[PDB]
Symmetry: D2
Subunit: 117 residues, 4 copies
Amino acid sequence: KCPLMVKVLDAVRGSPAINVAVHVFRKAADDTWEPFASGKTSESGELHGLTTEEEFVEGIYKVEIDTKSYWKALGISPFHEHAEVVFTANDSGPRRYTIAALLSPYSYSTTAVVTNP
Amino acid sequence: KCPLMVKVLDAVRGSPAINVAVHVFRKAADDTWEPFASGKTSESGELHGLTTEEEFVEGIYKVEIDTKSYWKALGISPFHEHAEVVFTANDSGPRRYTIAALLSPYSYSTTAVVTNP
Amino acid sequence: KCPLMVKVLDAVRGSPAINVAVHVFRKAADDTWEPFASGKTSESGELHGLTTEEEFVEGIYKVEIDTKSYWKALGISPFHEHAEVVFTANDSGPRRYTIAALLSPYSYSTTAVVTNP
Amino acid sequence: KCPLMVKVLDAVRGSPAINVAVHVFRKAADDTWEPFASGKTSESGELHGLTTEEEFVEGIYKVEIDTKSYWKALGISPFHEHAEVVFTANDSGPRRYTIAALLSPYSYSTTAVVTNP
Ligand SMILES: COc1cc(/C=C/C(=O)/C=C(O)/C=C/c2ccc(O)c(OC)c2)ccc1O
Ligand SMILES: COc1cc(/C=C\C(=O)/C=C(O)/C=C/c2ccc(O)c(OC)c2)ccc1O
Ligand code: NA
Ligand code: NA
């Protein structure tokens, strides 16, 4: 809830993207992706509570957003299988991460908002 | 053609946005918007030939893209009346400007690529 | 605070865009733009309290975001003079409007999130 | 060339993103990512010639754009390790795919333009 938040918006309907599956992975020493956390976006398009300060150590993380299932639910043919946002988490003050995604059937945009309390 | 080019893409269909009206204005000495050029995008989503090197002097220009008529023709009631850029041109000498717009019913993005001849 | 909110993000620094001037206009019967509301974004990149339910009637509105002054404050040369988000406000249930903008020096993206309480 | 093209733009400088590494993978029968093609963007920010009509069969493809090396070379420490698309190709017969990426240090967007030959 504190260190890693995801927010997803729908650019076709001008709304939060609701009930979107989100999977978070951390890169392991053997360079495979290890499941870390997951959830579904809320009615406000948000997913909180994925991890804790103590669990969210420096490392390379992947946030996969299942955009294809979302567009299929709406009856709209999409391009992407999903979105895959990959980043290194870096200590340097008590940083929080918000991964924002804006979805269209044939385009997505993702931004990171990195702040301090 | 070369000095000012517009490209418009549809993020719902993954296609050029074809036959989109584009109106260009230039700010006059009395701080009003004067008509400068207009046209429609081609089957490739592009609009060339709006102006010339001789005509495209220093100034503040506004490019208004009629996105609402575009979406309405496809059965969609969009949020915005139009997409735009407003920019100062040729401040440090002539440049070539490509204005790219990416359209969704409730979102748009406008990007400039500026090249030195 | 309720019916019209603006949120601005900085894609270069991964942060809220703070102290950005925002001006809202409503189109008048003579097709000129009449000042309606204005403010600066907060430390969270947000601007609330622009209008009230009673004041925010159907009409055509323009939200201008002074992006050029923001980039100038950061010492970064920008393309746009500002962003100009123009839309019709439409009754049909108790709708709220959030105008979100994502800023880069040579590109901006704007989305509308339109919801009900 | 014709079947799969990549274009990369820099939203900080308003320019093509030049000499950006691009790696393409194809999902194999055993659900692993197999190397398919790679290259670097030209002075126009474009990468052509990755594959052919004969080689580019139905499949799930991943295009990984090395945006982190790009930003680092310009003195910028960016948020993301790379930009990507993952997509199913040629499901309803051969198509021509242009993958466009627009880059900022803490944000990227990937758009597909899909044309029927
Ligand atoms: C104060 O800073 C923060 C802001 C936010 C954002 C909240 C929010 O409601 C977001 C928004 O309203 C929209 C964000 C946005 C805008 C344009 C885009 O292209 C996009 O996708 C890449 C997303 C989330 C967490 C924060 O810490
Ligand atoms: C001529 O029309 C076509 C264009 C293209 C592809 C690319 C092209 O010229 C695009 C461009 O020159 C600009 C593309 C663009 C615009 C906005 C963005 O946010 C973005 O990044 C996600 C990219 C592909 C097929 C076409 O038929
Ligand atoms: Na000059
Ligand atoms: Na087929």
